[PDB]
Amino acid sequence: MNINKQSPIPIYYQIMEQLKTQIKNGELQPDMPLPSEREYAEQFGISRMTVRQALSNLVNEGLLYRLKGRGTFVS
Amino acid sequence: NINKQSPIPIYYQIMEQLKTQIKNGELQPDMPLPSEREYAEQFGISRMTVRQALSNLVNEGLLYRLKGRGTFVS
Amino acid sequence: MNINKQSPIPIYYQIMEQLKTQIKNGELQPDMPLPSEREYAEQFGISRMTVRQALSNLVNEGLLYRLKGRGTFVS
Amino acid sequence: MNINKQSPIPIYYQIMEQLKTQIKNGELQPDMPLPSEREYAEQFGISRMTVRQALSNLVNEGLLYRLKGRGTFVS
DNA sequence: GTGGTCTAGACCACT
DNA sequence: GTGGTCTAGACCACT
Ligand SMILES: [Cl-]
Ligand SMILES: [Cl-]
């Protein structure tokens, strides 16, 4: 994955779309954990809350779920 | 109004306070809420802490936002 | 720092010129943050949009740069 | 600062004692922040909850105070 | 002059 | 060692 920080397109939305592709692809397996929020933040070089905005929307769209204390998973 | 020392998250306390204000007609359909910045100053908390409460109420359909203008009771 | 709201000279331009003065003599030190867009707007009693036009112009002239989520700095 | 995971002495207590030493000889001074709970946990290879037990005890004894979103500080 | 996005971290709750 | 909540602001999009 790669985000473009100088795009008017919000970083969180860029992340959303790329994750959506991997979900519909099987590149991210169902009931298997995504990389942690801190892993994503580190690799994208962005704030964890920016990552979280994306993940929270995908959770709200029913594409992911969270298990507190454990991780974030493909629905 | 809120208790910042409670284990109960601030944003949730705000949610319930607002829910309470919507029922007893202290807040009625289409009237505007104080700005996010007003709330944060009123409570001595961060604006994002206010936003978590308001976004949850928006997502629950109890409030709606007009981009660039304000937040209102549904 | 003063702005004249009844001058035919656009507010954003008045701001640009006073900021250039402060940059030139060092009242705004290089690589140090300016007052927030917020601070300028509230002090002058104007729109943030108007402040941004001034600031964006200076960014385009290479006098200032912006770092998202942190501030506006003198190059 | 060192811990021994194989000692019968609880890790959180080992941490408490060394922090008390560091405070007494001035390595940690009043109103200055400690390393983050994360920093301690990662460097010793332990859970944050273990670090938190040490820190919570020192807060309870009045030697440290915490500010949400900011840090942990010597009282 | 509001809501939207973002920074660069912190401590808290919890199999 | 994760997700959850929070700080204390900033600039960006926009009737
Ligand atoms: Cl602001
Ligand atoms: Cl952390």
Q: How far apart are CA D21 and CA B25, in angstroms?
A: 58
Question: Among candidates A63, A72, A64, A67, which has minimal Cα distance to A41?
Answer: A72
Please name the method used to determine this structure. X-ray
Give me B31's structure tokens. 């009237």
**Domain residues for D67?**
1-75
Q: What gap in Å lies between CA B51 and CA B48, rounded to an integer?
A: 5
Both tokens assigned to C5: 């709201």
Which residues sit with Cβ closer than 5 angstroms to ligand 1, an ion?
Answer: C 38
**Cα distance between residue B25 and residue B52, in whole Å:** 23
In chain B, alpha helices (H):
10-23, 36-43, 47-59
Compute, in angstroms, the gap from residue C38 CA to the centroid of ligand 1: 6
Resolution stated for this PDB structure, in Å: 1.9
**Which ligand is located closest to the Cα atom of residue C48?**
1
Candidates A67, A14, A9; CA nearest to A40 is: A14
Interacting residues of D45 by C-beta distance below 8 A, sequence separation 6+: none
Please report which ligand is nearest the Cα atom of A38.
2
The CATH number of whichever domain residue B64 belongs to comes to: 1.10.10.10
Phi and psi for C10 in degrees, rounded to 5? Answer: -55, 140
Quote the CA–CA distance of D9 and C62 in Å, as a whole number. 60
Which residues place a Cβ less than 5 A from the ion ligand 2? D 38
- Helix residue ranges per DSSP H, D1-75: 11-24, 37-44, 48-61
How many structural domains is chain D composed of?
Answer: 1
